[PDB]
Design a protein around this nucleic acid. Structure first.
Length: 135
DNA sequence: TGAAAGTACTTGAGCTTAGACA
RNA sequence: AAAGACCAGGC
DNA sequence: CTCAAGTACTTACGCCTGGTCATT
């Protein structure tokens, strides 16, 4: 879903056509970062899953896309403006997936994070509670 | 992705005739 | 906290 | 005007425990 489906969905959306000047919006490519928490002061910092549970936070990662804005002014010169890393929302991250902060960590690393090495993961942390999607 | 059934409504159809006596 | 929904579970 | 043949309502166990969530 993260690697393929999101990119396919954003690229398959029809471009925004507006109109007289014309405006075109195109979404180039998605970007996922590690799950980070934006505090009251706005300073980002990685969110560990245990901190998400205890503080009733949402273990999610921000989503950034590249947006190119094209204006047609009828003067034969269309000005295209590209925006990098445009934040459009946060996607909850399944625990121990590829994009989770627990990915690839050894038993000692997980213990240092107060996470059970035997915990299989595969569930989302929404508002502190642990949610599992059923097929 | 796959009730089931009973009841209260409508709506259409649609059918030889002749006058005298009777 | 109030009733609403949803979910899981016991017999 | 008046008979059979189509379209609408109306309902499907008994409790009991709890946890979560959005509105208020």
């Amino acid at each position: 879903f993260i690697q393929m489906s999101v990119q396919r969905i954003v690229e398959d959306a029809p471009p925004i056509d507006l109109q007289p000047p014309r405006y075109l919006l195109k979404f180039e490519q998605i970007y996922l970062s590690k799950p980070t928490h934006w505090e009251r002061d706005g300073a980002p910092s990685p969110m560990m899953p245990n901190e998400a549970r205890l503080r009733n936070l949402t273990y999610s990662a921000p989503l950034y896309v590249d947006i190119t804005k094209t204006v047609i002014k009828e003067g034969e010169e269309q000005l295209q403006t590209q925006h990098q890393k445009t934040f459009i929302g946060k996607i909850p991250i399944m625990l121990r997936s590829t994009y989770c902060l627990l990915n690839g960590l050894t038993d000692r690393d997980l213990c240092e994070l107060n996470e059970c090495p035997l915990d299989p993961g595969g569930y989302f942390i929404i508002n502190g509670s642990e949610k599992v999607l059923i097929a």
